[PDB]
Design a protein around this ligand. Structure first.
Ligand SMILES: [O-]
Ligand SMILES: [Zn+2]
Ligand SMILES: [Zn+2]
Length: 229
């Protein structure tokens, strides 16, 4: 069941995996939810995405202290928008090692974000170059191609049936692809399909702006993106 913790919501998805949710009252649209992940790997915790703000991200760390009570070894953030990187300063204040796509770190300042400490780079096939993602444990990082943004990355969780599409993927009942302001409309569909192909055994797809869904999230997202081309 959902756990309200201050202004955030936490939901256990699997034995060692929780979803964090935070909200930003954005004038013109409404109060927009964004989801990320928290993963326990043995005696440490790994975070995927910040909350929208530093204050909210500090609350994620407070929840982790209360409910898990193990050190956060690292965080990976999945592109240079506020929902994913808005809380970088809070992570740094906590002494957490941070990672993002090299391109996300490059784009961060102009997007109003603080860059992560470390840059991930990717092979031609999309898989992270392993030397750039040291000690990632069960986190398997994949660049699916440009879509929601040029820099969007995705994360599978080994030992689970979960893959995280971030803002690239919307659920199977979504009416649109959300914020396309920085999108690559020509490549979106192929990138969504590449995410699915990278994590073919994932049965639970987690994403930024929908609740967890089946792989129908991937097929529906790609089919909607076929219209963008
Ligand atoms: O986003
Ligand atoms: Zn975004
Ligand atoms: Zn987003």
């Amino acid at each position: 069941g959902d756990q309200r913790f201050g202004d955030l919501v936490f939901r256990q998805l699997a034995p060692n995996v929780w979803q964090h949710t935070s909200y930003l009252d954005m004038p013109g649209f409404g109060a927009v939810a964004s989801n990320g992940l928290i993963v326990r790997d043995g005696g440490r915790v790994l975070v995927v995405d910040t909350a929208w703000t530093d204050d909210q991200t500090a609350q994620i760390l407070n929840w982790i202290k209360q409910e898990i009570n193990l050190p956060v070894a690292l965080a990976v953030v999945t592109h240079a928008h506020q929902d994913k990187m808005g809380g970088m300063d809070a992570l740094h204040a906590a002494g957490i090692a941070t990672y993002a796509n090299a391109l996300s770190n490059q784009l961060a300042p102009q997007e109003g974000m603080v860059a992560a400490q470390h840059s991930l780079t990717f092979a031609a096939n999309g898989w992270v170059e392993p030397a750039t993602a040291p000690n990632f444990g069960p986190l398997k990082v994949f660049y699916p191609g440009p879509g929601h943004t040029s820099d969007n990355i995705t994360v599978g969780i080994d030992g689970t049936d979960i893959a995280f599409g971030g803002c690239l993927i919307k659920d199977s009942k979504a009416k649109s692809l959300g914020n396309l302001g920085d999108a690559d409309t020509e490549h979106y569909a192929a990138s969504a399909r590449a995410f699915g192909a990278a994590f073919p055994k994932a049965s639970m797809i987690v994403m930024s702006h929908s609740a967890p869904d089946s792989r129908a999230a991937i097929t529906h997202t790609a089919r909607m993106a076929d219209k963008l081309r």
